[PDB]
Design a binder for this molecule. Sequence first.
Ligand SMILES: Nc1nc2c(ncn2[C@@H]2O[C@H](CO)[C@@H](O)[C@H]2OP(=O)(O)O)c(=O)[nH]1
Ligand SMILES: [Ca+2]
Length: 104
Amino acid sequence: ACDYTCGSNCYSSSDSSTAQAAGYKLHEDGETVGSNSYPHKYNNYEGFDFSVSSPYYEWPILSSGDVYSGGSPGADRVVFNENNQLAGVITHTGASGNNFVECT
Ligand SMILES: Nc1nc2c(ncn2[C@@H]2O[C@H](CO)[C@@H](O)[C@H]2OP(=O)(O)O)c(=O)[nH]1
Ligand SMILES: [Ca+2]
């Protein structure tokens, strides 16, 4: 079973933890990768009720199991805060335009 299901993509806790560690490290170092400059501030326009406090940052989580290092980011993201706490896993899949919906 999946811990997080983003559309058709299946993720376990280990998948999200691994992606998060990568995103947080780049955040600390003040470095970004890809044309969209990840990791970057996630404003939460959607108004998701995250249990942890802002500010939030989004970083891609890939269905291939590999850590994002540039190129196409896909539709899935892990959202973490300044304390390196996981807020949630979101996706553009099943959401209109560039909006997000939570991965169930
Ligand atoms: N839907 C959405 N996009 C966000 C949010 N925060 C930042 N963005 C960025 O705002 C722009 C319009 O959605 C995009 O460039 C998007 O970045 P990503 O596309 O990298 O997620 C947010 O809370 N919701
Ligand atoms: Ca996996």
